[PDB]
Each structure stands twice: as structure tokens, then as C-alpha cells.
Design an enzyme around this catalytic site. Structure first.
Site, PDB file in Angstrom:
ATOM      1  N   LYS A  45      -2.221  -1.557  -3.461  1.00 39.66           N
ATOM      2  CA  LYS A  45      -3.082  -0.313  -3.462  1.00 39.66           C
ATOM      3  C   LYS A  45      -2.139   0.863  -3.599  1.00 39.66           C
ATOM      4  O   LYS A  45      -1.109   0.924  -2.897  1.00 39.66           O
ATOM      5  CB  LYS A  45      -3.800  -0.188  -2.123  1.00 39.66           C
ATOM      6  CG  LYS A  45      -4.688   1.085  -2.038  1.00 39.66           C
ATOM      7  CD  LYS A  45      -5.311   1.164  -0.685  1.00 39.66           C
ATOM      8  CE  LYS A  45      -6.223   2.380  -0.521  1.00 39.66           C
ATOM      9  NZ  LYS A  45      -6.706   2.476   0.874  1.00 39.66           N
ATOM     10  N   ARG A  53     -10.555  10.711   1.040  1.00 35.68           N
ATOM     11  CA  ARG A  53     -10.523  11.555   2.223  1.00 35.68           C
ATOM     12  C   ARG A  53     -11.642  12.592   2.210  1.00 35.68           C
ATOM     13  O   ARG A  53     -12.391  12.704   3.182  1.00 35.68           O
ATOM     14  CB  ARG A  53      -9.154  12.230   2.329  1.00 35.68           C
ATOM     15  CG  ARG A  53      -8.022  11.218   2.420  1.00 35.68           C
ATOM     16  CD  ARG A  53      -6.634  11.834   2.353  1.00 35.68           C
ATOM     17  NE  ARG A  53      -5.657  10.755   2.415  1.00 35.68           N
ATOM     18  CZ  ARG A  53      -4.367  10.862   2.124  1.00 35.68           C
ATOM     19  NH1 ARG A  53      -3.839  12.022   1.741  1.00 35.68           N
ATOM     20  NH2 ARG A  53      -3.596   9.787   2.224  1.00 35.68           N
ATOM     21  N   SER A  77     -10.222   5.632  -4.967  1.00 40.48           N
ATOM     22  CA  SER A  77     -11.055   6.778  -5.194  1.00 40.48           C
ATOM     23  C   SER A  77     -10.573   7.685  -6.269  1.00 40.48           C
ATOM     24  O   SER A  77     -11.383   8.090  -7.135  1.00 40.48           O
ATOM     25  CB  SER A  77     -11.272   7.483  -3.858  1.00 40.48           C
ATOM     26  OG  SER A  77     -10.033   7.974  -3.400  1.00 40.48           O
ATOM     27  N   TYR A  91     -14.941   0.814  -7.390  1.00 42.32           N
ATOM     28  CA  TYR A  91     -16.225   1.547  -7.265  1.00 42.32           C
ATOM     29  C   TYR A  91     -17.020   1.410  -8.502  1.00 42.32           C
ATOM     30  O   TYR A  91     -18.230   1.753  -8.507  1.00 42.32           O
ATOM     31  CB  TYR A  91     -15.961   3.007  -6.941  1.00 42.32           C
ATOM     32  CG  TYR A  91     -15.229   3.208  -5.625  1.00 42.32           C
ATOM     33  CD1 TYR A  91     -15.892   3.153  -4.411  1.00 42.32           C
ATOM     34  CD2 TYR A  91     -13.885   3.442  -5.561  1.00 42.32           C
ATOM     35  CE1 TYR A  91     -15.166   3.297  -3.241  1.00 42.32           C
ATOM     36  CE2 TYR A  91     -13.199   3.599  -4.363  1.00 42.32           C
ATOM     37  CZ  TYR A  91     -13.855   3.489  -3.253  1.00 42.32           C
ATOM     38  OH  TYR A  91     -13.186   3.623  -2.029  1.00 42.32           O
ATOM     39  N   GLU A 102       7.487  -7.102   1.298  1.00 40.47           N
ATOM     40  CA  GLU A 102       6.236  -6.894   2.041  1.00 40.47           C
ATOM     41  C   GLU A 102       5.279  -8.069   1.942  1.00 40.47           C
ATOM     42  O   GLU A 102       4.721  -8.550   2.937  1.00 40.47           O
ATOM     43  CB  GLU A 102       5.598  -5.587   1.570  1.00 40.47           C
ATOM     44  CG  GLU A 102       6.124  -4.306   2.154  1.00 40.47           C
ATOM     45  CD  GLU A 102       5.787  -4.114   3.627  1.00 40.47           C
ATOM     46  OE1 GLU A 102       5.004  -4.930   4.097  1.00 40.47           O
ATOM     47  OE2 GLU A 102       6.390  -3.176   4.234  1.00 40.47           O
ATOM     48  N   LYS A 145       0.870  -1.161   0.000  1.00 37.50           N
ATOM     49  CA  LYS A 145       0.000   0.000   0.000  1.00 37.50           C
ATOM     50  C   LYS A 145       0.931   1.242   0.000  1.00 37.50           C
ATOM     51  O   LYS A 145       1.765   1.417   0.938  1.00 37.50           O
ATOM     52  CB  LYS A 145      -0.948   0.020   1.232  1.00 37.50           C
ATOM     53  CG  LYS A 145      -1.776   1.335   1.256  1.00 37.50           C
ATOM     54  CD  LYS A 145      -2.776   1.337   2.375  1.00 37.50           C
ATOM     55  CE  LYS A 145      -3.489   2.655   2.420  1.00 37.50           C
ATOM     56  NZ  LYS A 145      -4.713   2.594   3.317  1.00 37.50           N
TER      57      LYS A 145
END
Ligand SMILES: [Mg+2]
Ligand SMILES: [Mg+2]
Ligand SMILES: [Mg+2]
Ligand SMILES: [Mg+2]
Ligand SMILES: [Mg+2]
Ligand SMILES: [Mg+2]
Ligand SMILES: [Mg+2]
Ligand SMILES: [Mg+2]
Ligand SMILES: [Mg+2]
Ligand SMILES: [Mg+2]
Ligand SMILES: [Mg+2]
Ligand SMILES: [Mg+2]
Ligand SMILES: [Mg+2]
Ligand SMILES: [Mg+2]
Ligand SMILES: [Mg+2]
Ligand code: NA
Ligand code: NA
Ligand code: NA
Ligand code: NA
Ligand code: NA
Ligand code: NA
Ligand SMILES: [Zn+2]
Ligand SMILES: [Zn+2]
Ligand SMILES: [Zn+2]
Ligand SMILES: [Zn+2]
Ligand SMILES: [Zn+2]
Ligand SMILES: [Zn+2]
Lengths: 320, 318, 320, 318, 320, 318
Positions: free
Chosen positions: B243, B210, B269, B307, B228, B200
Site C-alpha cells: 500500500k 483522511r 483513496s 474503490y 518486511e 505500507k
């Protein structure tokens, strides 16, 4: 990555359908299906095949009628297999390149009626020779490589003239892909695809097709590295797709071929594989769910497309 | 294999639809889609999100209504993102593990109504802290690793007790996957999946959702992502995630190639906003939605938090 | 290497800017930037593009003036894209090779005024055909491969004569890199580079460029292994650089191409990518920092150079 | 990919500066540079080093003055090398962990003055033992492994308490990275980085810095270096280093390729001396400095400890 | 293999000389050494080189005398570098192929006197052009590739006629290895080896040789993948050995080249590397043991042979 | 790289000695040689071995005399093989760990006389059991794994206390390397090397040295050898060995390639016997000795246990 129980429990993702679906590595779709189909001479002919329950050999008129369903179900292509009248078989296999042969007639009819449907013709002399071998014999009874290629080239050209978008040499002569490709290119058939039968084995699984020597050309079932050499040559010679035949009994070859070359890779679930499965299903020994299991296996092994006599059944099951 | 023009013409397979279809290497299906959804505190409530045209924040009752269409479309899972009322925020982030917090309530309601729908809860403190960092701050303003894990653990446990099938730690603390897994196993939550946000990045593409550079990854780094992921798999993750998404497709590919494990990607987003904005301005065709999602599949993702999941589902069901 | 928490805490190197900087794996520099630029006929022309905020199409005189800044900022090269007057489009695309065409005129002007600036010309017929396809149509409406190459060769030669140091065939005809290379070599253009658009996809991301069929030549977005085959051929055919288009949506292809071939690898952040980002920035939905993030991504994925309409903005940000 | 002349002419990209710049595979930046610096005990003190023309040993106040130019140039970190007064040397090397030793004092002063500058302290007993070996000797004259670690651990802890962001064990004891990491973690020094000297060779190139073959590596050995690095990564190193530098560029490349971890290299005193000597004699152009440093980058190093760091920074800032 | 302290202590094998010797991965022998040597015109000439302490340029007579020691010490080969009288330099570089040139005369003399000693001649025009570039200039001042190859071929042929067993093209023209190989084969010089300078960088380390533009042919120091492409071509073109120049500063390239191609791989420790080390030794800043350390490094990196001005010193140290 | 005749003629490098020498890929040196030696109980004793022409069993005093020539030739190490007096054999193999057994006495004498000569002792019960199996038998005649390890451990410890720098377990019990290493470390024998016989086959080539198929490997198996080696490295072996030698050169190559660790090979009694017999019969030239040893190097061995070590040393010293 040092994954260890109980930190790692591989059953967690199996716990629910949703997570099984999220992690599922392969799916079969109708885009993966090619229907082989046996084509008779004449008009109004339909013949059942006892060793292939539920498959019929059809005259051209009846093929056109059935192709409505196949098109409607979204099957991308057919692989045509003529049933040559015995009287038209000869030592020289000349019927292979007759513009009025069953394959050529069927191709023009289908190309006209269903312009978006792929037609894959079979380039081989075995349906055209009196002796049934894939090529022309020499005076010792051996199937001559380069002389056979001459006839296979004329055949492939005749298929291209008839409108086939794909020719599929199933002969296992050395070098035939390059010879056919040169011929197509020279003649202006720039976009006719060649679907090489690259690794076609000398197999017992072909029984029912014959119902519906070879070790000097078809591959020994025992050999796997050899298949890589076969495919490499066919890709160098210009094949657009490469195929393994038979299918299930050779899934390890499909996986090595896809892994090694990263090229469009096809597999033929042959007559005997269909018959085995159908027979067990009809006896109640296996559930019908085995059909989509068998097809999923080819996808998992790396195949891009599958020639399968189950194409219609599977396409209906999938369309739901 | 010494393929050379004109023997090899790669346009031949492109000549016709049927051959394009036979050689097509990847296909998107509804099975690949996870819908993130912003969940409000109230009732008979929806809010439009300025920087995400077409997405609504939904109260739980509204979420249940819409989940009807999502389940009927075959969307396998939702990723729940609560919108915490400001008054519930604190330096200790205790609201994260409130049994009657938004995420917990939403989970229980969905589990009961739609038992086959996957629910992926968010394990992170950022919607619970007054300052908005993903963990607890020390007196110097640094996001403390191990103290944060202790809260995250209690969060995850609360999600599991609410019935979540998957918990997804999005915090980028070191070691949290292992600590969470240990806790789930010791509590008897044998089958709760952990979807680690493994790689991420400290990204500008989170605008619309946000010091973050002390825990989220530097955009410049690729090899680091493999380290990771490796750790999260050893620590017991059932799935691993990258991400943001499109801007990191190379990372998706390396992670899938290296580990051969269930690999997910979040189209965040800002990626949604920039695509929709462009579609609404008439600058890009709607076809760019499916193209963006096909890219994730091609890169190696098993599933995609997007989304666009409902519209893509609708398009695929054509 | 058995790295495990808490012995290994990957946050340690993240703790301070200094250590982040020491371990940072990639950096963007102005040496990585190529500015595409739309070139109009005439004099004193400057046109805004609504779907690409902040980008202007410029006549040659105005391009020369703007190129002062670009040179001063250290941008190594421009990629020229003429805006062909509609009346000069034709079935035969002959304007593509007109020595007095916009691209040719622009090239000679730039080569004279800024001798060290790289000029990358676009080799394709789509700006020159009435029908807007990349090549010449046959009587069935298909874009003919080899006939198109004939015209693309004349075009590339005309660019070389004009002084271009790089020609970039963006056409996706099979074999065009080798044909252009042969032609350049035969004509004595020994050092003209060919920047192949190797893996150029049939993409929705090109919208705004058109503002500023294809599936039979451009690649299917779904395909990744196929891109490797594409690049391999272009390298064998003599390309000096290979490119992926579009950019962000294909970063996985950039990484596989760099990893597989270890050759100079370029990527085009196309008009739609610019427009998406600009639009979100202007709306306040994303910070301006996304520009350098987007460009860093290409470096991380393995690109050596980036064709980007953000080249000037990014070069200014970097020069600080 | 069957590239063949004259279709492929590799000179075409070399034809013009612009194309050389576009295809250039590696670039050195100031972000890659770490300056080693010899630190004296006194005040208003500098000393010239005979075998390292142009480098001065500096008292702490002098170090703080010069660090002004180093920070303004953007040099990210310094590597501190104290010059221990002889009277402070002993068989137990206790001065290594003196809270008011040179390294500790220097660290605290730099941390306060230049809080963003990285300080990498040297964890080794060689500047603290009367005999100059990197560890403690037994009665037979052998450098004891585990007893040495105990001192090295206390050293590292003292550096951490002085505020060092990175400790760099240069001792080549087996297992010391793990022992140091364990101690740092148990003491709460969560974020102190360990820059292991993983593959440090028994080399003649250390002449100017001043039985070693029982702990430092045989120059002949390459595979062995991978085993060394592997262990240090498993033991918790955040970075790994090869020393010396140019004479071991193959090792840099193998280590980067094998592990994909943050990899550093030390251009040692003798490499500096031989380059400067040659430049001062007029035998080599000054351009050889940047060429030597570009080589480290090309070989795979993320960062380079180099006595040329300031001049290289100056050159790059052109 | 999960090796962990204290079960694994890598110091154990370091504990004693015997075990260090058993596990030592590489050793240098006199079979790895090639001595470069500067050859003057005339008789009784010996010149010291200030920037290369202890190296002398020698006339042929004096070279023959020194070659007694070199042969006796078992040095397998010399690499000859003529020092061309200034008056014999020209625009056309014709002295390069003069049968009476220094290199040709030296070769015949050595071949006669020491028949088993390898002679490696230098194929390049830089010692023969007035302007000192490696090839022939065009009217823009650029070093022309193919015209230069014409002269390099005549040179290589003249070396072969003189009896050289190895010719080593150090020019960095594209394609020269194949052109020289064809020429050798056509002329009957079937067994003359070609030692390609494959990856020769545009380096500052050559200073003292000059004592004793280029970026358009020699490689950029920053580039590593490019070196693989260079070597691949030279092997395809028929090189018998491939070389990296300079040496120490490029040990990573030596290792990648050996690893990738598994072919006979050579490296040149150039004049500046010798001078750096000598200077530091003479100043007392480094012990003489650095010489064998520097040479061991090349073996460790994968080199089969090393061109080094330390060859005699090292051979004496080794013979003990 | 598309090398094709006549552009590529691989005979060109073979044309002359000098070019053969420059391209030669491997060279044997004395550093590669370890001499096995059969050690008797008495004094002023030697015995000729019928099935190994030219090799003598030597009492310790005789071993010390001959070791003079071996050290002067530069042979780095000996591998000691005691010939146990029959009366000292037993079902418990206690003689294996007798502090005054042949191996122990020989070791102490050599360590004192020739301190730089490596001594590699044999850790195995076969010369100590009445029945000649490498481990202790249960009532059913099976060679017990773990009970055997307990004896082998005490053996190894006795060798270490006698001063052996290397102990070489030749027993093929599972897990013995780890058990031995653990014991050495707990006893403070930090630096005692363990040279594991990792892949030791149930071979007919051991004829002259003199149910084995339950512990030694099946000749047919290759992959299995990698699993064997892997375990011994994880268990702490400093070197790993394949036995027999020539008949297993493929195993040498795979083991070196896979692990990049110090790899040894034993040219056993039967390989010596068949080569010498053939040389004595005039059937093979003496040059076959160096060719056989070059093969081990080419295959990847770092060192070779060979009864030809002295003659090869003599030949190399020419
Ligand atoms: Mg074949
Ligand atoms: Mg597939
Ligand atoms: Mg309501
Ligand atoms: Mg993590
Ligand atoms: Mg997938
Ligand atoms: Mg192409
Ligand atoms: Mg790069
Ligand atoms: Mg002062
Ligand atoms: Mg170590
Ligand atoms: Mg790097
Ligand atoms: Mg070259
Ligand atoms: Mg070698
Ligand atoms: Mg006596
Ligand atoms: Mg074992
Ligand atoms: Mg070896
Ligand atoms: Na498919
Ligand atoms: Na999926
Ligand atoms: Na670049
Ligand atoms: Na760096
Ligand atoms: Na050699
Ligand atoms: Na050895
Ligand atoms: Zn047939
Ligand atoms: Zn968060
Ligand atoms: Zn176009
Ligand atoms: Zn030290
Ligand atoms: Zn030259
Ligand atoms: Zn035994």
C-alpha cells in the site's frame, strides 16, 4: 520465509470459497481455447468417430454451420485437420500444396464467413503421403529432412494464400520453422504467424487421431532437456508461438518451456487424452468436472493456449 | 533465444484480436476484487466524500442494501473502514476493541446476512486515537510499538469474535503479525486469516482517505519491503499486501517474485481520486479503470483493494 | 538471514531523520529529468492546455526564452514534440523529414543557443499523417511495418542533420531501431543516440497529449514477458537507451527491464499521469509532495531518467 | 542481448555531458557521509595527528564548535572515537562503561546541542585495555570471547543511557551483536540501532588509527564475510559494515548483493593517510577524494565512514 | 545453513595459524604478477620518478640487465610502456607503428634475450600524439573512433612483427578488439594474444604515470553495469584476456567481471596506487605488509593476474 | 559472450608457459595438505602396510621423529588414526574415550613437541568395537544412532582434553555434530574445531584402510549430500568433508558451490593404493600425484587429507 505450523496453517485460505477465490493462482477462460476439427471432402457429410465420443468429422458446408456456435461461444481459433481422400495420397505429397485441397478450401471459406475467427492450418505431409510419414522418404526408407522442408514450404505458402493467419508445422523436421519463415517473408506474408510444434513426442497417445520411423524425428518421451534445445531453435528461427504435444503427459515440459523462454506457449490435449477422459466419464468412473480440471492443469503449468477437442464443452461451461 | 527481426516480428501476434487474446498474459476477473467501504455509525445514513467523487460513506443498514448488488456481481470480499464518531476517540484507543463498535456491528450483520461474503476488518488504532496516529503515543509524541500491539491484539480478537474471516493489520508496528497470530491461535480462532499490510509506505497518496515516517516506509526503499514481507510470513500472515498501489507496482512484482505467496495491493483513496477526477474532467477515458486494475494483475497481485471494484465488476460482467 | 522480531525491529532505522537518510535506497536528482515540450509553428505563440494545467505549447522563439530557466536549473535534456499545422499532414507523412519542419527548425535553434543541452527528437509519423496513426497505411487500413520504417529513417536522418544528439523512435514498428541505426552509421552520424521506445503500451493514459489500429503495434497492457523480448531486440539492434511508456502504470515493467538487461533505462510519465496528479493537487485532494513521490518511484523501480512534464517544478524543488 | 559494434557503440552515451549525466548509475550525496572524530579528554584542546594530515583530535567543547559546520553541511552522523587517557586503562577495561567516560560525555553533549545529528558510538575494549587488544586477555594472552562480550554489553548499555542513537560494535567477538541486542531490548532501549562491524579484517591499513588474527578476518577470505554478515543480521543488527574500505570493495558488493540490507563501509585511517599524503605531495589531484567515495557507492554501500566527510560535503554543496 | 552462535563461532578457525592456513581462500603467487616498465630511448639511461619512489625508466640496454633479476624471480611477463621523445610525437601518431620505435626495438631485444618471458605491448596512441589523447582528433576536437582504430591496427601489427606474444589495447575505442583481432588473423598472427583494457575508467589515479576529452572514451567512475557490457563485447570480439583499470578503486568491478564471464581477468594497480602506498610506507604511516595485502585483494576479488609496479618487491617477498 | 572461432582461439593462452601460468585457475600449495597417519601402540615400532606401499604405521616416538620433516615442509596438520590393540576392543567401545588411549597419548605428545602443528583426531567407534562397525550394535545387529553418539561425545571430549585443535567425526550417525558441539561448548572447549565427515559414502575404495549401508551414503546419491552438509553446518561444524575423494569430485564441487564453507576431501587408502600401485608397476608417471591433488583444488576443496602429503610437499618445495 520460515513459515511454520501453527503460526502458518495453509488451510486458512482454504476455509471459505471467497478466500479460495482470492488466492487462486490460475483461471481458465475461453481466450485459452483452440478447437481442432477434422474436415472431410464433399457436401453434407458428418461422421462420428468411435474412439472420440462426441467428435464428428465434417464437410466444409457442415463446418461452416457448426462454426456459428463456436464463434458465438467466443472460441478464438480453430486448428484444421483435413481428412485426405485415399486416392489423393501420393509419394510426393503434392496434395499438401494443392490450392483446391480440403485445408485450403476450408480456410478460404472460413476466412470469408467468419473474418475474426483464427484459422490455424496444419503444415505436415503425413495426411498426404501414401506411407503416412511426416515427410518424404529416401531410398533407405528414412524421412529426408531438407527435401521434406521443400514440400512443407510450398504447403505453408498455399495456406497463407488461402488466408490462414497461422500455419502450424507439426512435422518435426530440423530447421523447418526458419525455412518456412524465410519463405513467408520473401513472399510478403509478413504477418502470418508460425505456431511451431517444437517439442512433439513419439507418443502412444495419438491412437484415436489415426482412427479419426517416427522415432527418427519425433522426440523420445524420456527426454526433457532436449525439449529446451528444440524450442530455443524454433524461437531463433522466427516462431511466434511454440507448442508441446501431447499435453497432460508432458505438463512438466510445458512448465520448463514457459519458465525458460517466457514466450507464447501452447499445448495440444491430443485425441487419446480426449478419448481416455470421455470414456471414463461415459462409464461413470469420473465426474464431468474432470474436463475443466484437465484444462486448468495446462494453465497452471504455464500454457497460454490449449488445442483441445473439449473446447466447445468447456466454453459452454465457462460462459455460465 | 536469438530472436531477430525480420524472422521475429512481434507485431504478428498483435495483428488480430484472436491472436492478441491467445497470447494475452493476464486477465482481470471479479475473483481479484475487494471493495473497501466506509461505514458510519447511524441509520438511514449516507455521506458523499468530497475528495472521492462517487463514493458514499454508508450506515450499516445501507451497507447491507448495497451488499446485495456486490454479492450478485460476485465481488468476493469487502474491506471495512469505520468512521468513528469523534466523541468515541481517546488516548487509549479503547473503542478499537469495543464489541459494539462500528466494525464489530457491521461484521456481525454482514456475516449473518451474506454468509459467503468475505469480511476483512481493519486492525489499526488511527480511527480510535484522538490524535489520529496508528498507535499509542508516549509523552514525547512517539508512537510506541509494543504498547500499541497490546491494543491491536484486543482489536483483532474482537473482530474475530464478531465473525470476521480476515483481519488486516494496517498499523506498521514491528512484530504485530506474530502477536496477533499468537492471540488468535491461543483463543481458538484457528481459521481467522491475517492479511498483513507488510509494505505500507509513508505516502502522499492517502490524502482523500483522511510522525508517520517513524513507522510507515520511506517511498525510496524497495529492498526493505522484502525484509518486511519476510518477517510477516514467518510471523504467520496468510496474505501480504503493498500500500499504496500503482505508485508501488515494482514492489508488488518483487514481492510476488521473491516469496510466491498470496499478494494483495491497495489502490488507495488518492489513486481513486486522481483517476476519477480525470475521468470527470474529461481528461481520461473510462477505460483507464480496467487498465489500472490489469496493471496490478500483471505485476503479480492476486487481489486488489479498489474503490472501483463495483464498476469494474459491472464492466467485466459485460 | 533469519531476521526476527524483536531482535530485528525495522522501525529502528525509521526512528530519526538521520538514519532514514543513511539507509535511503534511492534519490532523485536533476540529472534524472527530461522535459517534454510541445512546439508550435510561428512567432510569439503560447497556448495553454486545459487538460494539462500549467503546461504551454510554445513557438520556437518562446521556447528559446523558457529554455534559459531550464538550462539554469540543470535539466539535462528536452524531448521535443512538434504540433504540426493540420494543412501540413498528408498520407505520405513527408513533413516528418522536411528540413524546415518544426522539429528540425527547433533543434537547430536550440543546438545553436544552448550547445550543452540535450535535444531528443521524436521519430514517429503520427503527427504527420492525416489519419494520425504511427505509420503508413496499406489498402486494408493496416499500418505497414517496413514501408513506415522507410519514412522513419528519413525522419531520423533529418533530425541528425539538424544537430539532434538523440533520436527517439516512438513508433513501435518491428525492426526500426536497427534500420535507423544502420542509416545513421552509413551516413556518418556515428554518435547520434537512439532512445528506443521499446515497451510502449496501447494505453488510455495518453488522453491529454492528443488534447495537447494502435493495438496492432502498441503493446497489450496485460503483457509483461513480451516487454523483455521487445527490449532485447532493441538492444541487439543498437539502441543506446531503452524506454517504457507510460510510466507509473508500468513500474513493474521498468523494474523487470532494468533487472534483466542492466542497460540505460528510461520511462515516460505521460500526459494523463501529469493531468491526474495536477487535477488532484489543484482540487486540494493531494499535497504537492506527491510530485516528488511519483518521481522517486521511477528511480526506485530502476529508471535512469524520466521524461516528465513536472521536470521544471521538480528541478526547482530539488535545487533548494 | 547480442549487442555488437558498430550497431552498439558504448561511446555514444559518453559523447556529451548531458548523456553522461542521464546514464550515470550512482551519485554520492551528503546523505551517504558519516564523519569519524577523535575525541580528547580535556577542554580547549586540539591535537594534530602526524599520520593523518589535516585531522585534529578534539576536546568535547571543540567537537561542539566544529559540529556546527558539520550540521550546516548536512552530514547526517558522526562516529565517535575516544582517546583514552593512559591512566584510565586497565586489564578489566572498566573505563569502557564509565558513565562519565569521553564517549558518554560527548554523546550527552551532542545529543543536547544538535538533537537531529546521529551519534554512532564505538563498542570495543581496545581504547580501554592496557594492552590494546579489542577484548580481555586470558593468562595465555588469548582474547577471550564471552568474557569480552560481558564488558561490551555494559559499554553499549552505557552508550544507550547517554543517548546514542547507534552503537557500533567494532570488536569482532563471535555472538556479540546478539548479546548486545538482547541487553538493549531487556533494558528498554528499543530503538537503539546496532551497526555491526561484520567483516572487519586483520589489516595493515589501520596503521594511522593507532593477536588480532585470532578475531579479525584474514584478508584472503571473501566467502567467510557472507557468513559473518548473515549471523549479525540474524542476531539483530540494523546495519552491517565492512572495514577497511577501498581494499575490500569486492566484499561491499557481495554483501550488498547477497543480503540487500543497509550496508556501510569504513575508509580507514591508512586509506585517508595514503590519499592525503599523495595529494599533499602533488602526486594525485584532489578529485581523487570524490572518486574514492563514488567507488563505495558504486560497490553498493549505503553510507561511508570517511575522514574526508567534511571536504566531500563542501565539494558536493558546490 | 542456519549457522548460529555459539554452535558456530567463526573465531575457531582463526584460533591457530594452521587452521587459518587450511581455510584461507586465496593466495598470491609469482604467477599472478606482471611488471609494467617504462622504456627510454638511447643507451645507459636510468631515470628516477619522483612521484613513484623506487621505479626507474630505463633504456633498452639497462632493461635487459634488470630483466635478469625479473626472470630469475619467475615474473611471467612485462608490460612495456615507451617514453616517446617529444620530437617524435605527431598529429598522425605514426611513431606508434614505426618498426624502429622504442616498443618495437625493446620487444625484439627481449624476445631474443629471454625467449620465455612474456612481453605485453601497449596499443594506444596517447604516447605518440602531440595532444596526448588516445586517438586521432577530428576538426571539432573529438577523438574519432574508427580512424583511430586504423592506426591502432597498424600499431598492433608492428608489435606482432616485433615478436610480442600479447598486445594490450588501452585506447577505449569502440570495436578495436575485433578490428585488431581480424587484422592479426588475416596477417597470420594466429597466436598473438589480445589483452583488452575492457573497463578502463576516466580516473584521477593515473597522475604519476603522466609524471613518469577522456570522458568521451574512458568510463565514468560511477558506472558498474556498463563495465559488463564492455567486457561482453570484447570477449565477443576475440579478446583472450580482459582487464579492469585502475585497480583497487575498482575491486567491485573485478569481482563482477569474473563472476559474470568466467574468463581470464586482469587488473592494473596503477601509478597513483603505487605512489599512495609507497609514500605512506616511506612516511612510516603504513607497514610494508600493505603491499602483499593490496595484491591479495586483487586475487580475492577474482583477478587472475595483476599489472603492478610492486611486482619485483612482491616476488622477492614471495620467493622466501 | 558470443565467443566464436577464429576470433576466439582458446589455444592462444596455451601457446607459451608464461600465458598458461597467468591464466591458470588453481594452484596447489602446502597449505592445502593434511597427512593422515596410522599410529601404533608400542615404542621403536614401525609396520609396512601391504595394501599401501610406502606408508608405515608408526609408534608415537616414531611419529614424533617423522613430524620433524613434516613440520619443516610446512604441512599444516596431521589426521591421527590409531591402530587399536585387539585386546582393547569391546562391545561398549570404551577404549575410544580412554585418556591413555593411542589417540590421546599421541595428541598430547604432538601438542607439546610441535605446538603450531594442527592435530585432527578421529571421532568414531570402528577401531574400538569388537565387530568393527562405526557405532554400537543392538541385539538385532543394527548400528544404534543415539547410543553411539553418547560414546562419540565422550571420545571427542577426551580428545579435546588431550589438546586436539580439531576433532573429526567420521561415524555418519545422524545428529552427532550437534551433540559433540553442545558437549564441547558446555565443557568450555570453545575453540575446538569440528571437521564433520558430512558426505561419507559406503564405498569399496576403503579396502586398504581396513551394515555400513545403513549409515554411510549410497554412492548413487548427490542431492542427499547437500542435505547432509546443511545439517552439519547448522549443527556447528567449522569444516565439512567429503569421503572418498576423487570418485566424488562432483560432490566436492556441489558442496563448495552451495555452501561456500571450508570444504575438505579425503583421498582414501584405496585411491592412494591404486595410484601407487600403478606408479610402482610403471603404468603411470609420478606426475599423477600432483594432478590428482590439483583436481581437488579445482573442484573446490580448501584442504585435502592425502597419504601423498609429504611427497607432494617435497615436489612443491621444488
Ligand atoms: Mg525442431
Ligand atoms: Mg499464463
Ligand atoms: Mg431505510
Ligand atoms: Mg513489519
Ligand atoms: Mg497472478
Ligand atoms: Mg520493438
Ligand atoms: Mg538507478
Ligand atoms: Mg574555548
Ligand atoms: Mg561476527
Ligand atoms: Mg545504493
Ligand atoms: Mg569497449
Ligand atoms: Mg582466481
Ligand atoms: Mg628410538
Ligand atoms: Mg549427517
Ligand atoms: Mg579454493
Ligand atoms: Na491464454
Ligand atoms: Na486473484
Ligand atoms: Na539518472
Ligand atoms: Na546512502
Ligand atoms: Na594467476
Ligand atoms: Na587451502
Ligand atoms: Zn505429420
Ligand atoms: Zn492506521
Ligand atoms: Zn506515433
Ligand atoms: Zn577494538
Ligand atoms: Zn592511451
Ligand atoms: Zn568409523
Amino acid at each position: 520465509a520460515n513459515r511454520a505450523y501453527p503460526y502458518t496453517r495453509l488451510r486458512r485460505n482454504r476455509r471459505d470459497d471467497f478466500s479460495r477465490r482470492l488466492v487462486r493462482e490460475n483461471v481458465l477462460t475461453v481466450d485459452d481455447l483452440i478447437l481442432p476439427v477434422f474436415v472431410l471432402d464433399g457436401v453434407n457429410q458428418r461422421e462420428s468417430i468411435p474412439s472420440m465420443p462426441g467428435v464428428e468429422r465434417l464437410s466444409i458446408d457442415q463446418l461452416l454451420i457448426e462454426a456459428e456456435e463456436w464463434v458465438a461461444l467466443g472460441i478464438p481459433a480453430l486448428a484444421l485437420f483435413p481428412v485426405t481422400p485415399v486416392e489423393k495420397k501420393s509419394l510426393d505429397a503434392a496434395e499438401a500444396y494443392n490450392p483446391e485441397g480440403i485445408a485450403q478450401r476450408a480456410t478460404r471459406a472460413l476466412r470469408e464467413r467468419f473474418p475474426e475467427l483464427g484459422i490455424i492450418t496444419d503444415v505436415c505431409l503425413c495426411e498426404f503421403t501414401t506411407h503416412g510419414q511426416c515427410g518424404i522418404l529416401d531410398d533407405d526408407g528414412y524421412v529426408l529432412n531438407d527435401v521434406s522442408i521443400d514440400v512443407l514450404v510450398r504447403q505453408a505458402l498455399s495456406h497463407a494464400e488461402a488466408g490462414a493467419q497461422v500455419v502450424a508445422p507439426s512435422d518435426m523436421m530440423d530447421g523447418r520453422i526458419g525455412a518456412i519463415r524465410e519463405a513467408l517473408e520473401s513472399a510478403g506474408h509478413t504477418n502470418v504467424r508460425v505456431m511451431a510444434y517444437s517439442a512433439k513426442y513419439a507418443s502412444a497417445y495419438y491412437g484415436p487421431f489415426r482412427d479419426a520411423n517416427r522415432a527418427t524425428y519425433q522426440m523420445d518421451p524420456a527426454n526433457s532437456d532436449e525439449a529446451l534445445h528444440e524450442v530455443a531453435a524454433d524461437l531463433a528461427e522466427g516462431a511466434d508461438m511454440v507448442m508441446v504435444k501431447p499435453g497432460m503427459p508432458y505438463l512438466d515440459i510445458v512448465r520448463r518451456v514457459k519458465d525458460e523462454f517466457r514466450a507464447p506457449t501452447f499445448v495440444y490435449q491430443v485425441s487419446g487424452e480426449y478419448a481416455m477422459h470421455m470414456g471414463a466419464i461415459q462409464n461413470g468412473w469420473l465426474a464431468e468436472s474432470v474436463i475443466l480440471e484437465s484444462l486448468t492443469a495446462f494453465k497452471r503449468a504455464g500454457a497460454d493456449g490449449i488445442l483441445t477437442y473439449f473446447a466447445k464443452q468447456a466454453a459452454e461451461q465457462l460462459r455460465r
